[PDB]
Design a protein around this ligand. Structure first.
Ligand SMILES: CCCCCCCCCCCCCCCCCC(=O)OC[C@H](COP(=O)([O-])OCC(O)COP(=O)([O-])OC[C@@H](COC(=O)CCCCCCCCCCCCCCCCC)OC(=O)CCCCCCCCCCCCCCCCC)OC(=O)CCCCCCCCCCCCCCCCC
Ligand SMILES: COC1=C(OC)C(=O)C(C/C=C(\C)CC/C=C(\C)CC/C=C(\C)CC/C=C(\C)CC/C=C(\C)CC/C=C(\C)CC/C=C(\C)CC/C=C(\C)CC/C=C(\C)CCC=C(C)C)=C(C)C1=O
Ligand SMILES: CCCCCCCCCCCCCCCCCC(=O)OC[C@H](COP(=O)([O-])OCC[N+](C)(C)C)OC(=O)CCCCCCCCCCCCCCCCC
Ligand SMILES: CCCCCCCCCCCCCCCCCC(=O)OC[C@H](COP(=O)([O-])OCC[N+](C)(C)C)OC(=O)CCCCCCCCCCCCCCCCC
Ligand SMILES: CCCCCCCCCCCCCCCCCC(=O)OC[C@H](COP(=O)([O-])OCC[N+](C)(C)C)OC(=O)CCCCCCCCCCCCCCCCC
Ligand SMILES: CCCCCCCCCCCCCCCCCC(=O)OC[C@H](COP(=O)([O-])OCC[N+](C)(C)C)OC(=O)CCCCCCCCCCCCCCCCC
Ligand SMILES: CCCCCCCCCCCCCCCCCC(=O)OC[C@H](COP(=O)([O-])OCC[N+](C)(C)C)OC(=O)CCCCCCCCCCCCCCCCC
Ligand SMILES: CCCCCCCCCCCCCCCCCC(=O)OC[C@H](COP(=O)(O)OCCN)OC(=O)CCCCCCCCCCCCCCCCC
Ligand SMILES: CCCCCCCCCCCCCCCCCC(=O)OC[C@H](COP(=O)(O)OCCN)OC(=O)CCCCCCCCCCCCCCCCC
Ligand SMILES: CCCCCCCCCCCCCCCCCC(=O)OC[C@H](COP(=O)(O)OCCN)OC(=O)CCCCCCCCCCCCCCCCC
Ligand code: SF4
Ligand code: SF4
Ligand code: SF4
Lengths: 379, 318, 156, 115, 176, 70, 97
């Protein structure tokens, strides 16, 4: 056949085309492989936290949450209730950040450019929530083993309410442009069909499973933090194609607003990190007056806290699918091994199967529907 | 005085094309909640001039293994034909008053497909030859419906003279009797000019390069002028064809103002559509032409051949 | 007149043209591409400075290297740079492209894209805010406004 | 005359812009430049594009359809005849055979793009 | 609890079939998409007039680094090297020795602003609020060497941004 | 705001208006203030050539009326 | 009547900048002719304006000085010319000038 080299995240496709049809798709990854998993072995558990902001750099605080849940599990400590509600609050804001990127850059790739600009004026307002809690628009490093770094600034919850009060209308404007559009439907309907059994055997997760009717979501089957105290519905597809997965992501954005409306009303008072100075650093006003607090501030920031020896696989329902870390501890301050299970790694491996009997222009649609970011695929 | 007339046509066209790039970036800007160029000159008015100077003082890269003769011929053919199609247009008085003006427009339009073909050949790339073949197949497919649609409308006008379409619409726009034909004509002029949602080559950026991806600097600018000169001309053709303006021989400037407004709005409709829709897959825009547009165009050609005869409304030959 | 006057004004004309029509080809490699997409978003709207959202390599004036540059990707970044018509400028965005960043000591990372291509402006941050990147582009316009290509040619 | 001057002016202006588009700018050429763009990676084969049969059939289908349009062009002048019944029958016969030609390719999978 | 996104049976009465035929032939739902972009053309754009207008930030913003002083002018840093231990990117290099008056002070304090990930761990670790990340984010350079800060550059930033760094710390230290 | 797009549109509109006005006013300047004769068919050309021989001067747009007949 | 009040606001921006020269000056230096309330002026010549009816992000702006530290800044304005005391207010890190 004809062998082409498409590409310049950055990807390289070695495709074999019989005219307009795709005969085999051979993704070449590692263009953004950086040795994150090897570098983490030279860092303390706190120093390794910013590495997870940079794996899936559209869902920063969900990557932080998964790592914190893993370290908290090996530590055998529990974050306080207010911190958990904050993590769910910003986990769902992070879901909106990712789904806007997934839906709108997917639409941009297939020629629909306008919705990208509308919804990136809402991302620019959600980046202000990130910046007001952590000081960084994207790589907050706000979620940490033990809870969150700082408490919410006064007035932030009023601004989260004003934003969420108008976001439903913005999703409707998006749907008015895509959902019933015949050109958009022709590019997504019956494209990249995945059967339920193939989806499971190929290791898919997230909307890839749910687009094909599989009723699975870790926020409901294996809840973490306070997701079992929030009411929301899990969208389920029927055809298993790109269009059904597109609707699942758009409906999930509406359910995040539903959850966010509850984290604002049910936010409890209290502290925002575990009241255990051998894990979480003391307050600065007590590190400067108490001898115990100064010793623990000194040790937590130089040596770090020791994690009991053990190995855990901890996973969360990240916006892109099941995100998990297999974290191995040897009893010291530094992880012995940290395998990062990126949901897009298994999805991309299934591009060759999902692209059988499709045109070259459907590969763009298929890659968009898998919601692939090569920071987490390559690591 | 005739050589003055030619320049009074060519130069304003190249200025209209220049400031269509500004309007496209500002109409798309505001439809996307932003402003577009407003820094280079007041309200961006100097932006086309900066882009023009920039392009013509940049390296005009030509790959060493490219056929030089065809690499140079293609932009000359494209722009030369782009300006040629403007000479018979009755705005309200043609520069060259042709008896077969409509057929001249079709004849020159079908020659412009060569520039796409020659440019693809000259690249010696094969990342652009496939693009050229895809682009050429699209263009020739959609000039089948342009000819048959245009033939159907001329059966209510009587002749191929472009000025006779003014007389035909002296009582009513041809869009009412022929709105089914006008709809497909508008889409067919979008696909001929490779405008969204039919831009599989120019800016698809979906594992498909454009036939002029290898052009840079001035030669790229010339292709751009030809492409944008055709967008205005096709929309001016649509205004004359379906939105005829009344012509007062004593105040001909009244026609030009009204006809200029309609052409601008139709041109701004091209910009409106690019901001609103995704793009057809290549095999879908062929099915649009061969399976949807062509069957309907043929039926409406049969209907418009027999409608004048059965209503005793055959137009005069002169 | 003096000759130097005509050349001085012609420099301003071509300097003004080149900085008012900067067409960037963005190498979105890692997270820093997201902050580059927020500069194209409505709030900052780089298109209003004459800076188009995206351009193909053959019509691009500046290359924005936005993200970690790995050894595997290094040959491909040089190839795209070599094929950019001149004048060509390179903006290094973020720590990873600037000097290696978080992954400086990695076995698979180019410790700064200035090892592969010349760089005209370095934008610091991890990531730089969309406004800090727009400050770099505006800082590249002033650099081009200081060029004296013709004044130097006139004195050869 | 007026037409020849117009064509000469249009195509001379295009040629002038091309020459000043190749001589005005400052050039600098080297082997890494002046190579096909590809996508940043080296070519994967020294062979030309494979021949695709489907792209050949659209060109032929356009040609045969374009030839039948040539016969339909004189219809506006044909409607002025005194033998309208004969003219109308032959006008509809030509268009119907054009549709029958379309129906044949459609049902024989001639308009598809799936290999 | 789950919900179906695309599980519907279109009605097959002539009223509904003719509605879908009208949509297919009259392009009704495509023109509805043109009305959504027409509305935006008549809204106020969200663009700001940078550099004359600036995007909003908070007191917690992490920008360019700076070394601070006490009100007397003595350097706050006492060369404890906590910021150097916690720095996840190893961007801080410190050398110290007793000063002529016997105090514990640095002789080298370099931040490689090209290794730094602007994470803020250095100002969290610091026990005397010496090293901070200021509010400046507009310090792009023309060379790689201008971004290898030494102690003189960092002390110049502190004396340059103290008026604004002090105010930001005053507005956020109760959350720390 | 949206009306800041009009200055670019007005410049484009004026450019599209010049070709139509110039042709209209050049023809009248070159044809004695009237519309340029349209000769699509030989009969229309025959009369125009006849008007060129009847004007005394070699110009088909100079009209001779009843004052030229006695 | 409302459309007639639009042209009046557009005419009082010319008078609000001190005639046609002041109007054209800010139009070509700042690409914007809005009139705000003068909040203050710094020792380098920058003038700071506010207009609280504008949407958040455009309700504060600075018209840069035409000369600073010996550099002609009439055309070459830069965001780093804002001193720290006004850098906090102009970026909305505080409500107190
Ligand atoms: C020598 C020199 O001075 O440079 C000559 C110049 C470039 O040749 P070159 O400098 O030797 O560079 C070739 C490479 O070095 C050699 O390598 P290369 O691969 O880059 O060049 C290969 C090229 C070589 O082409 C040539 O060199 C021919 C000269 O191959 C050919 O085209 C063969 C020449 C036959 C051309 C057709 C006659 O040739 C041109 O391209 C200019 C002439 C072609 C443009 C003519 C435009 C005028 C007509 C347009 C107005 C009328 C409208 C017509 C509409 C179309 C109707 C058909
Ligand atoms: C490949 O990327 C890009 C595209 O492709 C998707 C584009 O369309 C565009 C679109 C925008 C442009 C401004 C490009 C064309 C610029 C011009 C200035 C057109 C040429 C203008 C002239 C006035 C020609 C000179 C003739 C004159 C003055 C007559 C006398 C850009 C910028 C781009 O970068
Ligand atoms: C130079 C590059 C040429 C580019 C090719 C396209 C040029 C246009 C072709 C001529 C247009 C035409 O058909 O005339 C229709 C029109 C038909 O208009 P008409 O039928 O209404 O006649 C006008 C006058 N009445 C009605 C009274 C009879 O021709 C004319 O208007 C006048 C004919 C003059 C012929 C002089 C030109 C002859 C040479 C033309 C070919 C040029 C060489 C081609 C080179 C190879 C090109 C690939
Ligand atoms: C139908 C009502 C149209 C207005 C009208 O009444 O005009 C009458 C008048 C009619 O004038 P007239 O010169 O055509 O004379 C009419 C009489 N007959 C039919 C005999 C010629 O229009 C004008 O005078 C000025 C033209 C303005 C209206 C043109 C509308 C065409 C718009 C088509 C494109 C639409 C896309 C818009 C995109 C905007 C968003 C970017
Ligand atoms: C008694 C008198 C009898 C006289 C005859 C009566 C005629 C009755 C009416 C005839 C039917 C109407 C035909 C309308 C044209 C058919 C279009 C068509 O084929 O649709 C199907 C096609 C295909 O639809 P599909 O994708 O759903 O597929 C249909 C067929 N299947 C499902 C089997 C595959 O749709 C399109 O045309 C796509 C449109 C894309 C264009 C996007 C831009 C639109 C923006 C609006 C522009 C408005 C233009 C206005 C221009 C004005 C200029 C002056
Ligand atoms: C050969 C015989 C000597 C003739 C003089 C000569 O060769 O050099 C003239 C030179 C040689 O060309 P050149 O190759 O040195 O030009 C390269 C690019 N510039 C102009 C920036 C130096 O011709 C010129 O370029 C002079 C300017 C005319 C071209 C640009 C404007 C009109 C198009
Ligand atoms: C200054 C600018 C002035 C306004 C310029 C005109 C703007 C027109 C575009 C905006 C339309 C508003 C949106 C809207 O109402 O659409 C909803 C409506 C309904 O959209 P719908 O598809 O959602 O309706 C579904 C329900 N059924 C099936 C029952 C209709 O759109 C229409 O009704 C348009 C029908 C007419 C289109 C005819 C085809 C075009 C032919 C052109 C001539 C040839
Ligand atoms: C009240 C009465 C109202 C009028 C009643 C008319 C009823 C007859 C018309 C409807 C019958 C249509 C037949 C049909 O359904 O064809 C379907 C089939 C579609 O095939 P296909 O799209 O490839 O399959 C799906 C692939 N995804 O189609 C095919 O496979 C082939 C279809 C070929 C059609 C070619 C037509 C082109 C010419 C247009 C008609 C011109 C007039 C013909 C002459 C008529 C003279 C009277
Ligand atoms: C028609 C146009 C003819 C002019 C062609 C000039 C040659 C092409 C050119 O411009 O290159 C000039 C060349 C140096 O430039 P180049 O080698 O192309 O690449 C430099 C990249 N840094 O400079 C060179 O070194 C070679 C320049 C050509 C030498 C010509 C010698 C003339 C010999 C007599 C010719 C017969 C009399 C006429
Ligand atoms: C702000 C909202 C508008 C936004 C822009 C939208 C419109 C774009 C422009 C549309 C096209 C119109 C262009 C403007 C041209 C108007 C000029 C004019 O008023 O007419 C000039 C005309 C002079 O021509 P002339 O033939 O000499 O007049 C006869 C004298 N014996 O004098 C006349 O006789 C005319 C009668
Ligand atoms: S500099 Fe920071 S934001 Fe940019 S690619 Fe590197 S880690 Fe990501
Ligand atoms: S911000 Fe983080 S990476 Fe930068 S110097 Fe401080 S601790 Fe190191
Ligand atoms: S800056 Fe602070 S943490 Fe770093 S050495 Fe000085 S006192 Fe210690």
């Amino acid at each position: 056949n004809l062998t082409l080299n498409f590409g310049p995240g950055v990807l390289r496709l070695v495709m074999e085309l019989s005219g307009e049809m795709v005969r085999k798709c051979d993704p070449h990854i590692g263009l953004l492989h950086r040795g994150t998993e090897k570098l983490i072995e030279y860092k303390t558990y706190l120093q390794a936290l910013p590495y997870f902001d940079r794996l899936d750099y559209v869902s920063m605080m969900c990557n932080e949450q998964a790592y914190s849940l893993a370290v908290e599990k090996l530590l055998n400590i529990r974050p306080p209730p207010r911190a958990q509600w904050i993590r769910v609050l910003f986990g769902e804001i992070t879901r909106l950040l990712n789904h806007i990127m997934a839906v709108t850059t997917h639409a941009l790739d297939i020629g629909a450019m306008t919705p990208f600009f509308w919804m990136f004026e809402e991302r620019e307002k959600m980046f202000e929530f990130y910046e007001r809690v952590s000081g960084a628009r994207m790589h907050a490093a706000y979620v940490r083993p033990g809870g969150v770094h700082q408490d919410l600034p006064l007035g932030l919850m009023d601004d989260i309410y004003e934003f969420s009060k108008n976001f439903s209308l913005r999703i409707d404007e998006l749907e008015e442009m895509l959902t019933n559009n015949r050109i958009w439907r022709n590019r997504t309907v019956d494209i990249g069909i995945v059967t339920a059994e193939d989806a499971l055997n190929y290791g898919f997760s997230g909307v890839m499973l749910r687009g094909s009717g599989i009723q699975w979501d870790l926020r409901k089957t294996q809840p973490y933090d306070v997701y079992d105290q929030v009411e929301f519905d899990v969208p389920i597809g029927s055809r298993g194609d790109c269009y059904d997965r597109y609707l699942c992501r758009v409906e999930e954005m509406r359910q995040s607003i539903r959850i966010i409306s509850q984290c604002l009303n049910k936010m409890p008072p209290g502290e925002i990190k575990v009241d255990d100075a051998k894990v979480s650093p003391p307050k600065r006003a007590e590190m400067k007056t108490s001898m115990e607090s100064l010793i623990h501030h000194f040790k937590l920031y130089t040596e770090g806290y020791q994690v009991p020896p053990g190995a855990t696989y901890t996973a969360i329902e990240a916006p892109k699918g099941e995100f998990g870390v297999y974290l191995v501890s040897d009893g010291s301050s530094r992880p012995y091994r940290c395998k990062i299970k990126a949901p897009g790694f298994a999805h991309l491996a299934g591009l060759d199967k999902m692209s059988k009997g499709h045109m070259l222009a459907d590969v763009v649609a298929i890659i968009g529907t898998q919601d692939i970011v090569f920071g987490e695929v390559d690591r | 005085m005739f050589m003055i007339n030619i320049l009074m046509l060519i130069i304003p066209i190249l200025l209209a094309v220049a400031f269509l790039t500004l309007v496209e970036r500002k109409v798309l800007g505001y439809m996307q909640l932003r402003k577009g160029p407003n820094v280079v000159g007041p309200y961006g008015l100097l932006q086309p001039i900066a882009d023009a100077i920039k392009l013509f003082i940049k390296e005009p890269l030509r790959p060493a293994t490219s056929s030089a003769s065809m690499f140079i011929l293609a932009p000359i053919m494209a722009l030369g034909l782009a300006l040629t199609m403007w000479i018979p247009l009755p705005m309200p008085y043609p520069l060259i008053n042709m008896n077969l003006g409509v057929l001249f427009m079709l004849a020159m339009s079908s020659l412009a497909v060569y520039s796409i073909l020659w440019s693809g050949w000259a690249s010696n790339s094969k990342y652009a030859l496939i693009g050229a073949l895809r682009a050429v197949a699209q263009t020739i497919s959609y000039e089948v419906t342009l000819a048959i649609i245009l033939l159907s409308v001329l059966l209510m006008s009587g002749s191929f003279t472009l000025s006779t379409l003014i007389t035909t619409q002296e009582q009513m726009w041809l869009i009412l009797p022929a709105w089914p034909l006008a709809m497909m004509w508008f889409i067919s002029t979008l696909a001929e000019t490779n405008r969204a949602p039919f831009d599989l080559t120019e800016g698809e950026s979906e594992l498909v390069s454009g036939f002029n991806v290898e052009y840079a600097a001035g030669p790229f600018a010339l292709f751009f002028m030809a492409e944008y000169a055709n967008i205005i001309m096709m929309n001016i053709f649509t205004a004359i064809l379906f939105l005829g303006t009344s012509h007062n021989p004593h105040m001909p400037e009244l026609y030009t103002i009204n006809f200029t407004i309609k052409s601008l709005l139709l041109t701004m409709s091209f910009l409106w559509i690019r901001a609103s829709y995704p793009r057809f897959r290549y095999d879908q825009l062929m099915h649009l032409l061969w399976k949807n547009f062509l069957p309907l165009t043929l039926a409406l050609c049969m209907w418009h051949v027999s409608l004048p005869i059965l209503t005793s409304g055959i137009p005069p030959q002169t | 007149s003096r000759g130097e006057y005509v050349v001085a004004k012609l420099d301003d004309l071509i300097n003004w043209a080149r900085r008012s029509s900067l067409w960037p080809m963005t190498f979105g490699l890692a997270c820093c591409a997201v902050e580059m997409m927020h500069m194209a978003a409505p709030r900052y709207d780089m298109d209003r400075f004459g800076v188009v959202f995206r351009a193909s390599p053959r019509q691009s004036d500046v290359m924005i290297v936005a993200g970690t540059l790995t050894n595997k990707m290094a040959p491909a970044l040089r190839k795209v740079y070599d094929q950019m018509p001149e004048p060509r400028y390179v903006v290094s965005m973020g720590s990873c492209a600037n000097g290696g960043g978080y992954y400086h000591y990695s076995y698979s990372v180019v410790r700064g894209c200035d090892r592969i291509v010349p760089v005209d402006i370095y934008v610091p941050g991890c990531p730089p805010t969309a406004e800090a990147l727009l400050y770099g582009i505006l800082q590249l316009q002033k650099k081009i406004k200081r060029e004296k290509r013709l004044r130097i040619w006139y004195r050869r | 005359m007026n037409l020849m001057l117009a064509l000469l002016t249009n195509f001379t202006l295009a040629t002038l812009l091309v020459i000043i588009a190749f001589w005005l700018p400052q050039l600098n050429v080297y082997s890494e430049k002046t190579s096909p763009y590809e996508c940043g990676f080296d070519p994967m084969g020294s062979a030309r594009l494979p021949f695709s049969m489907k792209f050949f059939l659209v060109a032929i289908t356009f040609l045969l359809f374009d030839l039948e349009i040539a016969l339909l062009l004189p219809l506006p002048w044909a409607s002025q005849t005194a033998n309208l019944n004969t003219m109308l029958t032959m006008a509809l016969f030509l268009i119907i055979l054009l549709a029958v030609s379309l129906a044949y390719e459609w049902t024989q999978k001639g308009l598809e793009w799936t290999e | 609890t789950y919900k179906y996104v695309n599980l519907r049976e279109p009605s097959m009465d002539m009223k509904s079939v003719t509605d879908r035929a009208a949509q297919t032939l009259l392009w009704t739902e495509l023109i509805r998409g043109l009305g959504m972009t027409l509305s935006y053309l008549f809204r106020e754009p969200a663009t700001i007039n940078y550099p004359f207008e600036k995007g909003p930030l908070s007191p917690r913003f992490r920008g360019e680094h700076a070394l601070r002083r006490y009100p007397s002018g003595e350097e706050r840093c006492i060369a404890c090297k906590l910021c150097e231990a916690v720095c996840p990117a190893q961007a801080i290099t410190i050398e110290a020795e007793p000063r002529a008056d016997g105090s514990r002070r640095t002789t080298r304090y370099d931040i490689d602003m090209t290794k730094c990930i602007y994470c803020g761990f250095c100002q969290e670790a610091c026990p005397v609020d010496a090293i901070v990340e200021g509010p400046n984010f507009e310090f792009s350079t023309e060379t790689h060497e201008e971004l290898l800060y030494n102690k003189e550059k960092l002390l110049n930033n502190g004396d340059k941004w103290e008026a604004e760094i002090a105010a930001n710390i005053q507005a956020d230290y109760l959350y720390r | 705001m949206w009306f800041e797009v009009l200055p670019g549109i007005a410049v484009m509109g004026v450019c599209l208006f010049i070709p139509g006005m110039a042709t209209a006013r050049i023809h009248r300047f070159s044809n004695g203030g009237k519309e340029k004769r349209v000769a699509h068919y030989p009969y229309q050309w025959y009369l125009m050539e006849r008007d060129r021989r009847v004007s005394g001067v070699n110009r088909s747009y100079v009209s001779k009326g009843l004052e030229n007949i006695d | 009547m409302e459309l007639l009040q639009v042209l009046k606001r557009g005419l009082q921006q010319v008078s609000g900048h001190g005639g046609l020269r002041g109007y054209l000056r800010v139009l070509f230096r700042a690409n914007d002719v809005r009139v705000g309330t003068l909040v203050g002026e710094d020792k380098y010549g920058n003038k700071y304006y506010e207009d609280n009816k504008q949407f958040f992000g455009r309700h504060r702006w600075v018209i840069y000085t035409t000369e600073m530290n010996g550099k002609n800044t009439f055309w070459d304005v830069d965001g780093s010319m804002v001193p720290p005391e006004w850098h906090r207010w102009l970026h909305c890190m505080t409500d107190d000038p």
